[PDB]
Structure formats: structure tokens, C-alpha cells
């Protein structure tokens, strides 16, 4: 849509702080859009 | 040969200013003259001698020619 995704795709970590939150905790979800970058949560 | 396919370069940074933000003649004379003098001096020993030789051969041959065309050289 009008809003660009949090991270634009194309085709990091070195500290414990930047690593916290990286571990998965819920089932996976995949999104595809017309106007927004795709995403995969968890 | 096209930009994008010339060669491999890594870790080089280049800083530039827009031509509208800078002078076209910075220290033209203050630094230009010293540089011209330097360049002139650096080459003179390599460029000038052969031409000095030409000059000597030129003046010698011309004089020798005239002298040979008269009664008492």
C-alpha cells in the first residue's frame, strides 16, 4: 500500500543485545502484497 | 569497454564537490606558477640539449656556407 514495509527485500549479529528477540516464539506466517514488501513472522 | 565491466576495485573512497560549490581557478597563479616552474625544470635537461645541438649545428653550417662563398673566408 501507501506505507513501505519495515524492510525492503533484495537478493548481521555480533552482540547479545542485538541477538535478544531473534529466537522464534510462535508459528510462522507468510504475507504477500500488491504494494508492500513480503514478510514472514516468527 | 563499458562502465560496470572495466576492472575490480575494493576499499577506495572518493569525495567530490559540485562544480557550482567551488572555484574554477583556485590558486591559479599562487600555485600554478610554482608547478609550471617545477615541471619546466624537471624536463629541461631531457628536452633542451638536442635542440641546443641543432642550434649549434645550424649556426655553424650556415656560417661555414657563407664563408665558402667568398674570396677570403
Amino acid at each position: 500500500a501507501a506505507v513501505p514495509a519495515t524492510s525492503e527485500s533484495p537478493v548481521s549479529v555480533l552482540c547479545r543485545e542485538s541477538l535478544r528477540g531473534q529466537a522464534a516464539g510462535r508459528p510462522l506466517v507468510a504475507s504477500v502484497s500488491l504494494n508492500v514488501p513480503a514478510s514472514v513472522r516468527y | 569497454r563499458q562502465f560496470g565491466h572495466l576492472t575490480r576495485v575494493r576499499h577506495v573512497i572518493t569525495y567530490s564537490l559540485s562544480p557550482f560549490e567551488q572555484r574554477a581557478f583556485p590558486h591559479y597563479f599562487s600555485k600554478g606558477i610554482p608547478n609550471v616552474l617545477r615541471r619546466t625544470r624537471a624536463c629541461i635537461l631531457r628536452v633542451a640539449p638536442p635542440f641546443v645541438a641543432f642550434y649549434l649545428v645550424y649556426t655553424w653550417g650556415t656560417q661555414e656556407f657563407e664563408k665558402s662563398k667568398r674570396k677570403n673566408p
Binding site: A1, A2, V3 | F3, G4, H5, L6, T7, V9, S16, S18, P19, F20, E21
Partner: protein
């Protein structure tokens, strides 16, 4: 204009984004500009206004350029500068 309207309203969705809009707006504008005001500002933009404002900031103006990576093909600044007109 329609894209902008949608971006504005969809962004102010949830307490966090709205809280941030409050805090930052008071610092930047000195007040919270309401959606109805943004709407008025958006509604008044037309093709003429877009041409004039774009011309004012982009047209024949010197840009700042940053490149990183395999950029042998990034155009020379003079060429980039001539592309501004």
C-alpha cells in the same frame, strides 16, 4: 494524494504510533496537527502545485550523492548534475 491520505491514517493505528505522533509533533510543529487539517492541506494540492513545488526543490539544483558497493557504473557527478534539468 490518495496514497498519502491512506498512509497518514493507516500509520496512526495503535497507541504507540499515535503517542509518538503526539510527542514528536509538539516538538516539531509545536502542536498536534489533526487529520482534518492534513486533509485540507492534501486536498489543495493539484498538478500545478506539484509542478511548482517539485521545480522549486529538484529543478537545476545540486544533489548530494552517496554510493557503496560495486559502483563503477554510478554516473559521474557532472552527469548526475545535468540530469537535474
Amino acid at each position: 494524494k490518495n496514497l498519502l491520505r491512506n498512509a497518514l491514517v493507516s500509520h496512526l493505528d495503535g497507541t504507540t504510533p499515535v503517542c509518538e505522533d503526539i510527542g514528536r509533533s509538539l516538538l516539531t510543529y509545536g502542536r498536534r496537527i489533526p487529520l482534518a487539517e492534513w486533509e485540507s492541506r492534501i486536498a489543495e494540492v493539484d498538478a500545478r502545485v506539484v509542478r511548482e513545488v517539485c521545480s522549486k526543490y529538484f529543478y537545476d539544483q545540486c544533489p548530494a550523492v552517496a554510493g557503496f558497493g560495486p559502483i563503477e557504473q554510478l554516473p559521474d557527478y557532472n552527469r548526475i548534475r545535468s540530469g537535474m534539468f
